[PDB]
Design a binder for these strands. Structure first.
Ligand SMILES: Nc1nc(=O)c2ncn([C@@H]3O[C@@H]4COP(=O)(O)O[C@H]5[C@@H](O)[C@H](n6cnc7c(N)ncnc76)O[C@@H]5COP(=O)(O)O[C@@H]3[C@@H]4O)c2[nH]1
Ligand SMILES: Nc1nc(=O)c2ncn([C@@H]3O[C@@H]4COP(=O)(O)O[C@H]5[C@@H](O)[C@H](n6cnc7c(N)ncnc76)O[C@@H]5COP(=O)(O)O[C@@H]3[C@@H]4O)c2[nH]1
Ligand SMILES: [Zn+2]
Ligand SMILES: [Zn+2]
Lengths: 359, 359
DNA sequence: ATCTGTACATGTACAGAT
DNA sequence: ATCTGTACATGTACAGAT
DNA sequence: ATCTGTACATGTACAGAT
DNA sequence: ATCTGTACATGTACAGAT
């Protein structure tokens, strides 16, 4: 039943090969451009993130996410009023003459300006490439990405995401986040929090305050580690261990949402990150690998579904790394929208998911 | 029962404080002296190893192992007669002002010369210490250590072990070693094998060829890791996890052997590394954390005893990292000594462990 | 001036103490 | 059940080197 | 400092086994 | 139907070389 759907969603070796050689050509070229050109982004480094590199991409290999991360030195952060996830970045002491002088304002590092130069460089280099059909997608407000459209023959999107890499303690808003103690352990949590944290040029809204200079926290690196080290036993899904169905529940849920979203404009507010967050919480609630036995795929998916509905009903979905940050606040997502998704999901669930059969 | 014995073997904090303050001073001063002038050992680095840092030291904190390890860049290893564990080290390059030219014995690096110099410097530094009563112990045949004897009132041994560090991949003799795949897993094993490997002086005084140019492999770093990360579950012995009794079993077995060795000179051939190796094999054999439940301390200890007895009776105890290196070979330990230990352990096992009550 | 090796600063798992 | 000393990892300050 | 080489994890594919 | 085992492919870490 769901086995058949997973067979459908499973990427094909040839397709992965073909898509990857092309994306890697383009990304390589861009990345070389960033340092080989005496730019203000010299020293930038590649970190692949997201579904494809987490092995939870479904249907086709047509979306690739990449961070270009730049080690900015000692910076001071300021919480963009009690969101937890948004900040203004100032320099403790401006060492001066540095690459990012012209991105500053009043001791503040403007996300908009820096992103716009990043973008300008990217468009410029993209015009300079002749063996691949590749263009730059129109900018979306509220997006930290510069997105590329490649037509191999087939359509592939690539998000190039500029990120500041900071090596200090994680911000205090994350102190109670990443609650993996009973699941992946305290040693894993402590190690993960010894890793750098990332800031991303996503603008905060209202259109009120310092919208354009605002950055946002990102833990794409931590999420990648988790997705690939997801068991309570060290050998989960390893060649000398036993398979679980955690990844496949993520795939099915992502598929449900993708399908519902294709059909219904009313679901625009919702996204795959909501599903990823919800399953992270579920993996926390039920840490034992035995609670994700492949033979229990259906019930596992069902429990995931019920949890998601609960989140819609209570209108609460806390960011996994930032507890105070409610992804389903009435501010972010309209109540009517959550009732709508609730009803659609309940429909599909109660009728053996007809929408898994269509295209 | 055995729990009361473990209560007796538990180290006291006040003792730990006292011993560690002194040990750390002396080690600190030696490492610093090595790091000075134009000594051959400049660049040497410190790695604390063995029981005390594995948290399996018993009775008193009166023994400390510390590795002074030196990276040796270009390096070629020749195996010593298919023994798996023993090698000659050759620099197939030119000195270029090499600090180790002085120890070169025509293409090869001499263990005994290097050790001799290391030791001479240590002795010299120890003379300049007037705070505490610390002396250098008479050299022991077959020992890669310069041993210090500190009278901190209480007598304390500090083994300063000279080591060569190579960052290349491990020698082929270890390919089928470290069989942790069904226990700690493939990712863990790959990571450990990405770590450097060590070489320490064999320093036998037997009389055989290449006696003073023979080094032995060492993985005390890896062993430390395994001891501190010993569960199939990432949360084993953590604060949101379940305690197991693996280390407690190691403690009991170490204690049985120590008591017997102090009573009977017949057991000089045996050492604690034998029980460490046996228990690593047991942990591979019985990988589930539920096979080391604290409630089953007697059973677990007993199965360990049973296993160990067979090793004596079949004359086989494979080095965990080097399969073909048999620690109980006829050539290392006499059948009489093995029979003697077998009978001692059998007796102990079948009559309440009276030796646990001694002293 | 600027640079950087050394060692202090901070955090927490582990396991003894109370 | 909580409190707490050691070992250990990583971030960062500044003296003395350049 | 930038790059290639090596090893092995993560995947898919598909013929022969259960 | 599912499992197993071999072949096939990419992603990622990091030693070591110029
Ligand atoms: N990845 C991610 N992290 C979030 O915290 C987040 N919050 C909302 N969303 C939305 O989920 C959807 C799917 O994300 P995808 O990864 O496929 O592409 C994302 C991703 O490649 C990148 N991106 C967005 N936020 C971040 C982030 N915090 N860190 C790194 N990359 C990010 O920009 C793309 C678009 O972001 P948005 O147009 O703002 O909204 C996304 C998107 O609609 C998020 N997506
Ligand atoms: N650690 C260790 N690794 C071995 O492969 C080995 N083979 C035999 N032995 C013997 O176990 C006994 C207890 O070891 P301990 O750790 O307390 O002190 C050891 C330890 O501090 C150190 N040492 C010995 N072998 C090594 C080694 N291979 N690597 C690092 N250090 C070592 O020098 C001390 C004396 O060594 P030996 O007199 O050669 O024989 C030892 C010892 O009699 C070994 N011990
Ligand atoms: Zn798994
Ligand atoms: Zn344990």
């Amino acid at each position: 039943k769901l086995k058949k759907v997973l067979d459908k969603l499973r990427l094909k070796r040839k397709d992965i090969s073909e898509a990857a050689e092309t994306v890697n050509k383009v990304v390589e070229r861009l990345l070389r451009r960033m340092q080989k050109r005496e730019s203000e982004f010299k020293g930038v480094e590649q970190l692949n993130t997201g579904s494809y590199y987490e092995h939870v991409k479904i249907s086709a290999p047509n979306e690739f996410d990449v961070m270009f991360k730049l080690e900015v030195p000692r910076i001071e952060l300021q919480e963009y009023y009690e969101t937890g996830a948004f900040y203004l970045v100032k320099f403790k002491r401006i060492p001066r003459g540095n690459p990012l002088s012209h991105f500053l304002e009043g001791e503040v590092l403007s996300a908009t300006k820096m992103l716009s130069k990043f973008r300008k460089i990217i468009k410029e280099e993209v015009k300079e490439i002749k063996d691949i059909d590749v263009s730059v997608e129109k900018e979306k407000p509220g997006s930290p990405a510069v997105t590329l459209l490649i037509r191999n023959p087939e359509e592939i999107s690539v998000d190039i995401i500029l990120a500041l890499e900071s090596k200090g303690s994680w911000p205090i808003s994350t102190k109670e986040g990443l609650p993996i103690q009973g699941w992946l352990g305290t040693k894993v949590r402590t190690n993960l929090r010894r890793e750098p944290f990332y800031l991303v040029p996503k603008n905060a809204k209202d259109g009120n305050s310092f919208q354009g200079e605002t950055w946002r926290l990102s833990f794409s690196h931590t999420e990648k580690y988790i997705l690939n080290n997801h068991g309570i036993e060290k050998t989960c899904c390893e060649s000398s261990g036993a398979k679980c169905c955690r990844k496949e529940c993520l795939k099915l849920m992502k598929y449900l949402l993708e399908q519902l979203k294709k059909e219904f404009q009313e679901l625009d507010a919702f996204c795959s990150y909501h599903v990823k967050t919800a399953i992270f919480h579920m993996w926390t609630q039920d840490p034992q690998d035995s609670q994700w036995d492949p033979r229990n795929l259906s019930s596992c998916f069902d429990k995931l579904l019920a949890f998601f509905l609960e989140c819609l009903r209570t209108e609460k979905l806390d960011h996994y790394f930032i507890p105070k940050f409610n992804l389903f606040s009435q501010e972010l997502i309209d109540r009517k929208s959550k009732e709508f998704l609730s009803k659609k999901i309940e429909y599909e669930r109660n009728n053996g998911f007809p929408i898994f059969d269509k295209l």
